[PDB]
Amino acid sequence: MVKVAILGASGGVGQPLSLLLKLSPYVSELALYDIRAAEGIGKDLSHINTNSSCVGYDKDSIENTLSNAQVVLIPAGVPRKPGLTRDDLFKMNAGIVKSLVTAVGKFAPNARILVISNPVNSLVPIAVETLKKMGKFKPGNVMGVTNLDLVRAETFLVDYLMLKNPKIGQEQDKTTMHRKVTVIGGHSGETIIPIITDKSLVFQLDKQYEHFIHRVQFGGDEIVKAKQGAGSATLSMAFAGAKFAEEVLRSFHNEKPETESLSAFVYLPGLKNGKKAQQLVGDNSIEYFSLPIVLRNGSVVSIDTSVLEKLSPREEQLVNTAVKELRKNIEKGKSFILD
Amino acid sequence: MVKVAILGASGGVGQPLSLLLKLSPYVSELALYDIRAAEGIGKDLSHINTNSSCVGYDKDSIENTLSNAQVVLIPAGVPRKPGLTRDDLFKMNAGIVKSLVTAVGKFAPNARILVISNPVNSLVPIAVETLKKMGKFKPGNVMGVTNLDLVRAETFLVDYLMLKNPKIGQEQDKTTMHRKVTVIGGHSGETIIPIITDKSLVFQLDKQYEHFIHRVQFGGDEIVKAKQGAGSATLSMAFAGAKFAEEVLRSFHNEKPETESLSAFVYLPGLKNGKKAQQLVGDNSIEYFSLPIVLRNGSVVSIDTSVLEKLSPREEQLVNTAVKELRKNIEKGKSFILD
Ligand SMILES: NC(=O)c1ccc[n+]([C@@H]2O[C@H](COP(=O)([O-])OP(=O)(O)OC[C@H]3O[C@@H](n4cnc5c(N)ncnc54)[C@H](O)[C@@H]3O)[C@@H](O)[C@H]2O)c1
Numbered sequence: 001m002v003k004v005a006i007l008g009a010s011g012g013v014g015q016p017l018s019l020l021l022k023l024s025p026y027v028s029e030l031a032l033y034d035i036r037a038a039e040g041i042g043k044d045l046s047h048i049n050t051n052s053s054c055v056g057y058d059k060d061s062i063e064n065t066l067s068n069a070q071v072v073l074i075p076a077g078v079p080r081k082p083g084l085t086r087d088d089l090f091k092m093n094a095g096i097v098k099s100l101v102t103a104v105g106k107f108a109p110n111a112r113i114l115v116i117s118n119p120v121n122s123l124v125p126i127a128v129e130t131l132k133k134m135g136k137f138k139p140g141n142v143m144g145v146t147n148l149d150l151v152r153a154e155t156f157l158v159d160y161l162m163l164k165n166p167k168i169g170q171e172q173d174k175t176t177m178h179r180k181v182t183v184i185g186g187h188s189g190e191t192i193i194p195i196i197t198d199k200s201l202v203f204q205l206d207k208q209y210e211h212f213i214h215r216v217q218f219g220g221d222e223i224v225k226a227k228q229g230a231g232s233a234t235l236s237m238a239f240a241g242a243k244f245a246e247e248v249l250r251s252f253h254n255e256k257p258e259t260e261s262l263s264a265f266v267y268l269p270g271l272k273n274g275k276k277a278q279q280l281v282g283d284n285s286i287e288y289f290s291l292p293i294v295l296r297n298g299s300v301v302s303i304d305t306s307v308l309e310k311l312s313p314r315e316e317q318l319v320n321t322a323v324k325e326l327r328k329n330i331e332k333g334k335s336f337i338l339d
Numbered sequence: 340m341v342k343v344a345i346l347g348a349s350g351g352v353g354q355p356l357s358l359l360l361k362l363s364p365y366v367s368e369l370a371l372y373d374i375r376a377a378e379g380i381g382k383d384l385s386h387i388n389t390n391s392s393c394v395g396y397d398k399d400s401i402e403n404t405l406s407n408a409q410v411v412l413i414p415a416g417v418p419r420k421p422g423l424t425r426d427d428l429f430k431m432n433a434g435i436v437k438s439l440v441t442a443v444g445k446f447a448p449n450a451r452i453l454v455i456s457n458p459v460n461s462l463v464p465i466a467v468e469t470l471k472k473m474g475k476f477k478p479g480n481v482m483g484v485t486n487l488d489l490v491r492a493e494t495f496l497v498d499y500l501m502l503k504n505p506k507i508g509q510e511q512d513k514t515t516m517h518r519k520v521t522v523i524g525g526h527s528g529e530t531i532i533p534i535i536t537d538k539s540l541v542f543q544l545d546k547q548y549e550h551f552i553h554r555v556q557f558g559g560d561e562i563v564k565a566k567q568g569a570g571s572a573t574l575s576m577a578f579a580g581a582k583f584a585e586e587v588l589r590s591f592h593n594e595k596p597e598t599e600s601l602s603a604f605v606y607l608p609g610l611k612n613g614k615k616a617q618q619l620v621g622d623n624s625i626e627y628f629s630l631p632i633v634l635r636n637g638s639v640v641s642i643d644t645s646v647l648e649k650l651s652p653r654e655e656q657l658v659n660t661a662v663k664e665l666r667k668n669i670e671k672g673k674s675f676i677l678d
Pocket residue numbers: 346347348349350351352353372373374375414415416417418419432435438439454455456457458459484485487570571572573576
């Protein structure tokens with residue numbers, strides 16, 4: 001009995017995201033919004049025989065969309081095309097995020113905002129600074145959705161074990177690999193830090209360990225390449241988004257998350273153990289990081305810093321490389337709002 | 340565990356259908372095929388952390404797609420769109436289904452073939468007559484997926500009870516309404532026959548009963564209008580197709596179906612109780628109809644005619660209207676192949 005709003009519901013990620021949300025038993029009302037086509041998508045989903053009402057809204061009805069929404073998912077954004085650089089992509093997506101998050105601050109300021117659009121590293125700071133200007137920022141209620149990195153880590157860990165030690169590989173369940181790997185950091189390239197917490201599995205991977213790390217880090221490129229440079233992960237991104245959203249929704253329902261060490265990109269200074277986590281990643285002013293979180297009533301109430309205590313030596317070096325680049329991605333987002 | 344192939348995986352229905360199949364615990368390998376883009380969607384999907392291996396294939400690689408496939412879903416087709424007549428759609432889909440079913444006959448002749456392409460009423464006969472010419476027709480292995488009509492009936496029964504009297508409406512779970520409604524007949528307009536098997540819900544509907552029947556029959560039209568002409572159901576059809584497939588997959592693993600009186604459009608003369616079904620619908624030569632099926636090892640082994648035994652008077656009229664129209668649709672399909 002959570003009301004969920006999806007902003008950007010007609011897009012490549014948004015459609016399958018809206019479908020997976022419609023299937024959740026934790027949702028009572030699903031409201032879909034987009035500048036185009038959301039009413040028809042809503043109507044199509046409304047035929048599905050699960051116990052949630054689903055309505056889509058036209059471009060002028062964002063207030064009806066958001067009214068009393070407890071959770072707001074934002075996969076809105078512009079897709080890559082000829083003549084649009086990564087910096088154009090950034091600037092248009094930053095304008096979209098600014099505008100959507102402003103609307104949340106106006107029409108549903110108590111909502112948990114789950115930012116799915118990319119680049120997360122910069123767009124989450126944009127969301128936070130947009131809300132601070134408005135006096136509507138609650139640190140536990142803004143989460144960058146980084147879960148696709150964990151999902152990839154769980155899948156590739158098993159793929160590399162199959163390839164390397166078939167007997168150990170055959171023993172693994174891709175759906176429970178979160179017990180053995182945790183992914184922290186940012187959401188792009190070398191900001192992504194996969195931490196295998198079971199050292200026997202690091203042993204079993206042998207010389208595939210670095211290939212594994214590279215593959216989780218550059219997973220998105222593998223799809224962009226598989227799609228001839230024309231698109232990126234849509235379906236797996238919608239999957240990872242809905243899986244994270246479900247963990248958030250379970251917390252309204254007094255249920256423990258199914259994912260061990262579930263991570264999200266969050267505002268460290270405003271959250272319990274955030275200071276400790278800044279100390280552990282070796283940068284005392286770094287404002288954002290994806291780390292394990294504890295949810296209560298849909299809100300992040302503290303950061304679990306366990307994983308950072310027990311880091312291997314090589315993991316320490318990944319963390320340092322990530323932090324360097326993440327500081328600049330954070331500042332690029334901050335300066336979009338602060339100028 | 341089960342190998343599944345999807346032919347037409349890149350489309351409107353195909354993509355989210357492929358996503359939902361990727362999530363199934365009954366699937367060991369998922370192979371995706373289309374005239375464009377299947378490699379890239381398969382690769383996207385392959386990052387999802389569920390145990391199936393998922394690979395997409397280029398337009399020249401249907402043999403590799405089909406090789407040792409147990410279940411083949413065919414959401415391939417041309418959907419409704421302005422400027423296309425009913426007859427244009429039939430002819431374009433007929434050729435697509437003939438060609439794909441030929442390829443099943445050649446490369447995976449033991450597969451269960453689930454036709455999602457519309458119009459089901461005519462395209463399933465085309466699939467059957469195509470297989471018959473090749474000597475590769477097994478009656479229990481060719482099913483028209485009509486399941487969206489049951490999905491709509493379960494949804495709309497709850498929505499209409501919720502207006503007529505909230506007290507009974509609220510006691511309903513959409514997800515288990517198949518205990519109270521079964522849909523039979525064909526898959527278009529007035530071929531569609533919703534049978535409320537609980538008489539006390541019929542009572543509670545009062546003069547919404549005819550509105551309910553009509554909404555189930557014309558659900559397709561409702562989405563086309565909500566999408567302003569731009570196709571019909573995509574996401575709800577992917578949901579319905581995945582649900583049906585799952586009942587098929589479940590039967591390989593010796594497990595009871597979760598859907599009471601699950602229906603599909605099947606070839607009556609090749610199946611146990613099909614002669615009895617023909618007599619009950621009042622046409623001793625009708626070759627196809629959508630009725631509750633019993634599955635064993637992914638194949639229909641009998642038809643359950645219970646629902647036809649105690650039809651209301653008014654249900655009797657729906658059945659008679661549907662059979663008239665069905666006979667024509669079936670004969671249109673058969674003539675496509677038989678010239
Ligand atoms: N069973 C139902 O209740 C139901 C409901 C809705 C839609 N449909 C039907 O599903 C079909 C697909 O609809 P859509 O909205 O996905 O259309 P779409 O145009 O979005 O997708 C169709 C896909 O089929 C592909 N295709 C065409 N010919 C092919 C071939 N020979 N081999 C492989 N792929 C081929 C196209 O490349 C495309 O990717 C249509 O027939 C539509 O009428 C059925």
